[PDB]
Design a protein around this ligand. Structure first.
Ligand SMILES: [Ca+2]
Ligand SMILES: [Ca+2]
Length: 279
């Protein structure tokens, strides 16, 4: 399949080179997989989700995404126009409030929730969790992310937007999950992207067009935007049978574009998520 005039990030993950505009992908499109978006919620009614999104848990008064952040990230995972895995099932877990903030205790509960809830869901091609969130180092938060991964979920987390070593941020610094840095459309490390030995992979993160609340769209930037590219890619590859929840981060690193990025500090991987789709 081919989506013409795609968002640059989608085009980038299906090219060995920057500057293209078509997103090439296998038509299976993550069908049969499930991605939990652990965030401010998902506006499931957005036409871009085509009925494939639903809220399954909220830690606040409402399940509504009153911010937009979670809806944007979910759109990059699996919306029709803005998504990597255009036929995946999306599950919203609202651990962040409508200002985009959340307590670590709540974020941990949300992770524990997904590890259990997946056993109530039909996800024959596997389960992914996208965590576009984080704060300062916490062993408890890291442990929650490690548990979620261990339970059989492909966990992708944001490296953080501090232009610093991700070792000091959580869940970014948890080694066993997939820690995602951000790049821009000219293959530079995004100006804000964290770096460091704990990063597994980079994904498109600067000026990313996706869904927003009120049935709208907008472009925003962050390692929050790179993370769902990798989560969606994982879902897509799992549907194709190329990898599993336990091994996808490593598979994505194996098969990434190598050495394409600039301003990568020595000791940080120079790896950019790539679907290696060959028609
Ligand atoms: Ca290249
Ligand atoms: Ca890792």
């Amino acid at each position: 399949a081919a989506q013409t005039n795609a968002p640059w990030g989608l085009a980038r993950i299906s090219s060995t080179s920057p500057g293209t505009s078509t997103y090439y992908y296998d038509e299976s499109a993550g069908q049969g997989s499930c991605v939990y978006v652990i965030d401010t919620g998902i506006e499931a009614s957005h036409p871009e989700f085509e009925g494939r999104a639903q809220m399954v848990k909220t830690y606040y008064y409402s399940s509504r995404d009153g911010n937009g952040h979670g809806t944007h990230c979910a759109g990059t995972v699996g919306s029709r126009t803005y998504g990597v895995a255009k036929k995946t099932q999306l599950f919203g877990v609202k651990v962040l409030d409508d200002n985009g903030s959340g307590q670590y205790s709540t974020i941990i509960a949300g992770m524990d929730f997904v590890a259990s809830d997946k056993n109530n869901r039909n996800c024959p091609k596997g389960v992914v969790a996208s965590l576009s969130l984080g704060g300062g180092y916490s062993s408890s938060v890291n442990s929650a992310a490690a548990r979620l991964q261990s339970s059989g979920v492909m966990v992708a987390v944001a490296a953080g937007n501090n232009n610093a070593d991700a070792r000091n941020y959580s869940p970014a610094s948890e080694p066993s999950v997939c820690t995602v840095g951000a790049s821009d459309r000219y293959d530079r490390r995004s100006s804000f992207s964290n770096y460091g030995s704990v990063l597994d992979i980079f994904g498109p993160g600067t000026d990313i067009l996706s869904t927003w609340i009120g049935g709208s769209t907008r472009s925003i930037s962050g390692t929050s935007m790179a993370t769902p590219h990798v989560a969606g890619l994982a879902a897509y590859l799992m549907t194709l049978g190329k990898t599993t929840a336990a091994s996808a981060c490593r598979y994505i690193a194996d098969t990434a574009n190598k050495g394409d990025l600039s301003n990568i500090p020595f000791g940080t991987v120079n790896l950019l998520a790539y679907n290696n789709y060959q028609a």
